[PDB]
Swiss-Prot record:
Signal peptide: none annotated. Coiled coil: none annotated. The gene is SMYD2. The lineage of its organism: Eukaryota, Metazoa, Chordata, Craniata, Vertebrata. This is N-lysine methyltransferase SMYD2. It comes from Homo sapiens. Its EC number is 2.1.1.-, 2.1.1.354.
């Protein structure tokens, strides 16, 4: 089956890719991909529906496990062939049931291949079986991690799946690591993980021409730039706030390729991204190389500390790190912004609304200067600052920030996306 107005071609040096045949304007929808296989992240059960992802109050709990909710019984029955892979296992394993989301999603992919071997509507251009794996590029540490996931798959999903051999399972796992998507809500909060075959056919660019948004469990690809007939459709696979070197470190590590787009070539946004303090005695080169090294290393240590250190301690880390950095860097620097965004999140947990709003206010502007025009990160930030304002009863400011969020969202999600009608109703109440 073909996908209208688009075409799968051979992108030189980028393997298989998707190009446009007709023109697409900013905001236009390229295509929609129903999810081939998906799973709702554990920290969201009860909040969202396990079948359609609809966010609602009062959802039908599952009688057997009491850990899976639905809007009604049609969603419960419709989700059974997939939920049964964990209902009983969740009750029998109890506190020992902790498969990694990657393992859960892969189990669902195996169940899907068994129930529907034929090509699905989610595979009109690219098929799950023909996914790029990058297995020959794997080293021993990465092969060891894929081995731990195969051990988890067998350990938790043996009641129903018919596993092939380790050769086939390390391939599928490499394929999921290369083409698996993560679903986020209107605030970029993680909801789940899914497999979107046709969507996984678009290569990466740091200057993307399309954004992927989700309408429930449906992928929607909308043009954020003008796409002319014959030019490739490009998506951003990573967080575009960081400098070139950081971006490619993530691209090479996770996707086995070194981007070459205009941005990675000329590195225009790099300067402002690593703004140095216009001091009287401007910092020395080696001082900057040393500060970038320290910053990158503390990013990693904070990722590690978020797993056992109390919020007070984490906040102390963002403050002390921002202290030591503020001597070479400007607050617009992406490393100061990183520590600040993390601090704002910690305040959001502690329910220190005013502290979270203060940090947000400080972050938003540089955030706009660093990301593209239509960026889901910028929109979700405006959305968060807007709901912070409205919660605290700052109607004027909340209305301004919310309007900014709807500005970008109308392009990315389309003007009729339920998220937008929801924010508009959010403006008509406080
Ligand atoms: N800009 C780019 N430069 C080189 N390779 C790219 C690229 N963008 C995507 N890729 C390749 O695309 C894979 C992502 S899945 C995207 C489609 C892929 N080209 C395929 O034929 O199946 C990456 O692992 C990498 O191999
Ligand atoms: Ni996770
Ligand atoms: Ni991706
Ligand atoms: Zn539902
Ligand atoms: Zn259940
Ligand atoms: Zn790039």
């Amino acid at each position: 089956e073909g996908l209208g107005g688009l075409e799968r071609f051979c992108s030189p040096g980028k393997g298989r890719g998707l190009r446009a045949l007709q023109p697409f304007q900013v905001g236009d929808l390229l295509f929609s991909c129903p999810a081939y296989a998906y799973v709702l992240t554990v920290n969201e059960r009860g909040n969202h529906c396990e079948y359609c992802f609809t966010r609602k109050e009062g959802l039908s709990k599952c009688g057997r496990c009491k850990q899976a909710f639905y809007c009604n019984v049609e969603c419960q029955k419709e989700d059974w062939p997939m939920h049964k892979l964990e209902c009983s296992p969740m009750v029998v394993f109890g506190e020992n049931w902790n498969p990694s989301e990657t393992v859960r999603l892969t189990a669902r992919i195996l169940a899907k291949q068994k129930i529907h071997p034929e090509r699905t509507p989610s595979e009109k251009l690219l098929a799950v079986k023909e996914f790029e794996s990058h297995l020959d590029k794997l080293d021993n540490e990465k092969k060891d991690l894929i081995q731990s996931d195969i051990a988890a798959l067998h350990h938790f999903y043996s009641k129903h799946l018919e596993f092939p051999d380790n050769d086939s399972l390390v391939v599928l796992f490499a394929q999921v690591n290369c083409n698996g998507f993560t679903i986020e809500d209107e605030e970029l909060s993680h909801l789940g993980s899914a497999i979107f075959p046709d969507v996984a056919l678009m290569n990466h660019s740091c200057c993307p021409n399309v954004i992927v948004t989700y309408k429930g469990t449906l992928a929607e690809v909308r043009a954020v730039q003008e796409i002319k007939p014959g030019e490739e459709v490009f998506t951003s696979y990573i967080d575009l706030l960081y400098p070139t070197e950081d971006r490619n470190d993530r691209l090479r590590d996770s996707y086995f390729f070194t981007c070459e787009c205009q941005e990675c070539t000329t590195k225009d946004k790099d300067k402002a991204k690593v703004e140095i303090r216009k001091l009287s005695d401007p910092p020395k080169a080696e001082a900057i190389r040393d500060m970038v090294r320290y910053a990158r290393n503390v990013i990693e240590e904070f990722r590690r500390a978020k797993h056992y250190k109390s919020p007070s301690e984490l906040l102390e880390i963002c403050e002390l790190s921002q202290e030591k950095m503020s001597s070479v860097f400007e607050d617009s620097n992406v490393y100061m912004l990183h520590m600040m965004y993390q601090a704002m999140g910690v305040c959001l947990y502690m329910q220190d609304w005013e502290g979270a709003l203060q940090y947000g206010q400080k972050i938003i502007k540089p955030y706009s200067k660093h990301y593209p025009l239509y960026s889901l990160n910028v929109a979700s930030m405006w959305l968060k600052l807007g709901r912070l304002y409205m919660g605290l009863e700052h109607k004027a400011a909340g209305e301004k920030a919310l309007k900014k969020a709807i500005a970008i969202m109308e392009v990315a999600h389309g003007k009729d996306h339920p998220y937008i009608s929801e924010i508009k109703q959010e403006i008509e109440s406080h």
